[PDB]
Amino acid sequence: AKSSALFFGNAFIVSAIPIWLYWRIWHMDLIQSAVLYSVMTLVSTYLVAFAYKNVKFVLKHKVAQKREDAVSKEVTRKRKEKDERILWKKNEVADYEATTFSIFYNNTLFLVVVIVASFFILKNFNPTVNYILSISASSGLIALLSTG
Amino acid sequence: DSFPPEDFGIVSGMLNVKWDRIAPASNVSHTVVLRPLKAGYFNFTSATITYLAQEDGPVVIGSTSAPGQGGILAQREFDRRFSFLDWAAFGVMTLPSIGIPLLLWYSSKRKYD
Amino acid sequence: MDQVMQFVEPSRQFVKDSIRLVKRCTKPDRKEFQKIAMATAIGFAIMGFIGFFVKLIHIPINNIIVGG
Amino acid sequence: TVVPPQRQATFEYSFIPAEPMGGRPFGLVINLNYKDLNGNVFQDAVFNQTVTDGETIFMYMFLAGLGLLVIVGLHQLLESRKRKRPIQ
Amino acid sequence: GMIITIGQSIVYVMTGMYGDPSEMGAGICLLITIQLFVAGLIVLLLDELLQKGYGLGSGISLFIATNICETIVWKAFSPTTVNTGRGMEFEGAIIALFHLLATRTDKVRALREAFYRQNLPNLMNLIATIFVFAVVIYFQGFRVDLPIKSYNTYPIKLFYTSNIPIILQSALVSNLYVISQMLSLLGTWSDRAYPVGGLCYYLSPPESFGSVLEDPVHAVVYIVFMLGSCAFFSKTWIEVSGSSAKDVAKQLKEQQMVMRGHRETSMVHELNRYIPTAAAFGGLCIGALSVLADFLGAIGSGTGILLAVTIIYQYFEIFVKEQSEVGSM
């Protein structure tokens, strides 16, 4: 559970990237818009990190279900005296890649949502409305999708 | 005289030009390059033309067509509507978000697959 | 989640079971289709041909009132 | 536009003849409506004379010959069968 | 019906649909009375003779279908004269070719003629129409069957679901449109009047290919109600047909006929699987075809073909039975 610090160290990143094009093509005022940016990033980091945990927690078992036979093979190739290696390593063996895919997929999911909203729906809308609706919808919808 | 120097800088050309003679069935084209210094609505009024229809004749005064009222877009608004290379630079800026997990996931898979 | 799926389940079942049923039920007919094929055009044309000629009495009879 | 006495004005006008007007003669009438300061309306017929997608080609005329490719294939697989009524 | 027709006739006579209400003469009211009363009642008694099997069933069906035969195909070849404002042109789109050939070297432009003519329009519409006419027979001929017991089977009717609805589905939209126009954000209209603003304009059917090119997004709104009525609002036609499970069951009990395999009684649950599912491709896709044709521009056909060619099918199977009596004999 204490590993959540990494999730907090990851969920915020993507939330702020679009500021470049917004300042370049939407020409947003970074001073006035900082009020919107801070809230958007904070909410995104909160729910997205929670989603990271949920996805990995919900699916980590499958990793062992698939490859535990191979991991056991290499563990032995290297019953009480034998099982300890299972607790020390095997559980993390499944966990380690489970996290990597969970975060990877979540980040991959986020990008298209903002692209579609900003440059295919909110094309015809105020840059203020463009950023507001695009980012707010992305955060809320993606978090709900993660609960799917 | 429709373009006051306080609102338009002359980059090239002249608002005032004289030609000694224009032959019959001939034409002359003049081009002026200005630079608007302020955004807003501007009325492109007609220019005045004076000429002699005959030697020692009376000066005939004519007017050009008037393009009418045009909008001068603010540079920020023009860029907002029509701003290319921004995406060229932006594309790379998005990569770092997934650098670590992207490499680690497959590295672990290969070590176990 | 599944309560949200409840909205999906009628759509999925009705479409998928309908298509299964349709294909299991109404197997092709192509050769007899060829037997009807020519008659389709023949009957369409000849029954249209009825009106296609019957109209020709009436245009000029309209002249009795109109074509003055 | 007010035109003072002994002065001239020049006006640019532009129009687009409709696409279906290709190949036809039309009477072009260009009228200039002007009035004096007294409100008398005058009209001058400055001109009153009689003046004389590749998707269209692609989407059938070209492609019919590719439907014919299906036909050439199937006409092989049908009519090559006609080699089974020779006689001893 | 007889009295409802008379009421309508009186209402438009009072309107004076053609003619001021007295100055042409009151005797034309008597004229219109006799005209419509006689016409309609005789027509009905025709349909009755046919249903009485001196013919075959409905006449009025066949009649309107024959009207469709004319109003479509007549335009292919009718040599009657038209003028653009150019000179001598013809109604029958096709045969113009032979005179163009005597007129112009410009064969490419003579062919483009097949794609141009905007009124009594160009052949390309006819070609689309022909293709639709040909295709639909594939769909309509399909049918499915169940064994029946006192080597014999009941044919499960299929596109019978298609027969009824589209009349209503088109009518309701058209009429609510008309209503909103007459009563007047909801809707505003340009000159055939057409919508150009309000919800009804976002709702309007994008029949023009220009409508395709100007905006694709609009078309979804039209699809949403037009198709969705076929998807869901149709479902109630179980009562209109009178063919829910406990209706068809009653009918078959009157027939006193039962399937192999399982009980008459549980046959309700047996047939239930087939009963709602018949509404799918049996009905809605005929609407999808209709709109396909109409927006391709098949002349008047997205109403007509649907019924007319189905009636051709019925007449074909009758023709098969009788003339096959000839062919067997």
State how far the Cα of E130 lies from the Cα of E132, in Å rounded to an integer. 5
C-alpha distances out from residue E82 to E91, E96, E106, E253, Å: 6, 11, 21, 61
Q: What letter represents residue D68's amino acid?
A: L
Nearest to A61 by CA among A91, A103, A83: A91
Residues of C within an 8 Å Cβ radius of A: 1, 4
Backbone angles phi, psi at E258, to 5 degrees: -135, 150
Residues 6+ apart with CB under 8 A from E55: E49
Of B83, B89, B94, the CB nearest to A17: B94
Nearest to B82 by CA among B94, B73, B90: B73
C-alpha distances out from residue E281 to B59, E223, E311, Å: 84, 17, 19
Q: Which two tokens stand for residue E326?
A: 């000839």
Experimental resolution (Å): 7.6
State how far the Cα of C19 lies from the Cα of E281, in Å rounded to an integer. 9
Chain D contacts of B60, Cβ < 8 Å?
6-8
Backbone angles phi, psi at A69, to 5 degrees: -60, -45
Q: Are C18 and E276 in contact (CB under 8 A)?
A: no
Nearest to E162 by CA among E312, E288, E69, E252: E288
Q: What letter represents residue A95's amino acid?
A: D
State how far the Cα of E326 lies from the Cα of E329, in Å rounded to an integer. 5
Mark yes or no for CB contact D20/E116 under 8 Å: yes
State how far the Cα of D65 lies from the Cα of D58, in Å rounded to an integer. 11
Q: Are E222 and E204 in contact (CB under 8 A)?
A: yes
State how far the Cα of A70 lies from the Cα of A67, in Å rounded to an integer. 5
- Give CB contacts under 8 A, 24+ apart, made by D12-16: D12/B65
State how far the Cα of E115 lies from the Cα of E76, in Å rounded to an integer. 14
Backbone angles phi, psi at A114, to 5 degrees: -70, -40
State how far the Cα of E270 lies from the Cα of E46, in Å rounded to an integer. 41
Burial class of residue E274 (count of CB atoms within 10 Å of its CB; 0-12, 13-18, 19+): middle
Q: Decide: helix, strand or coil at residue B20.
A: coil
Using the Cβ of E115 and the Cβ atoms of chain D, whether some distance falls under 8 Å is answered with yes
Mark yes or no for CB contact A26/B80 under 8 Å: yes
C neighbours by CB contacts (3+ pairs under 8 Å): A, E
State how far the Cα of A142 lies from the Cα of A130, in Å rounded to an integer. 18
Mark yes or no for CB contact E74/C18 under 8 Å: no
Residue located via tokens 């190739």: A77
**Packing angle between helix A127-146 and helix A34-77, nearest 10 degrees?**
30
Mark yes or no for CB contact B90/A20 under 8 Å: yes
State how far the Cα of A115 lies from the Cα of A134, in Å rounded to an integer. 8
Can you give chain E as a three-state secondary structure string? CHHHHHHHHHHHHHHCCCCCCCCCCCHHHHHHHHHHHHHHHHHHHHHHHHHHHHCCCCHHHHHHHHHHHHHHHHHHHCCCEECCCCCCEECCCCCHHHHHHHHCCCHHHHHHHHHHCCCCCCHHHHHHHHHHHHHHHHHHCCCEEEECECCCEEEECCCHHHHCHHHHHHHHHHHHHHHHHHHCCCCEEECCCEEEEHHHHHHCCCCCHHHHHHCCHHHHHHHHHHHHHHHCHHHHHHHHHCCCHHHHHHHHHHHCCECCCCCCCCHHHHHHCHHHHCCHHHHHHHHHHHHHHHHHCCCCHHHHHHHHHHHHHHHHHHHHHHHHHHHHC
The DSSP element (H or E) to which B40 belongs, if any, is strand B40-44
Q: What is the DSSP letter of B95?
A: G
State how far the Cα of E261 lies from the Cα of E321, in Å rounded to an integer. 32
CA C39 to chain centre: 15
Residue located via tokens 């009124």: E119
Q: Decide: helix, strand or coil at residue D32.
A: strand
Name the residue ranges covered by the structural domains of chain C.
6-66
Nearest to E238 by CA among E212, E277, E188: E277
The dihedral over CA atoms of E216, E220, E226, E228, expressed in degrees to the nearest 10, equals: 160
Q: Which residue of B has its CA nearest to A69?
A: B112
Q: What letter represents residue E190's amino acid?
A: S
CB atoms within 10 A of CB B105: 21
Question: DSSP assignment of A43-61, as one string?
Answer: HHHHHHHHHHHHHHHHHHH
Q: Are D10 and B62 in contact (CB under 8 A)?
A: yes
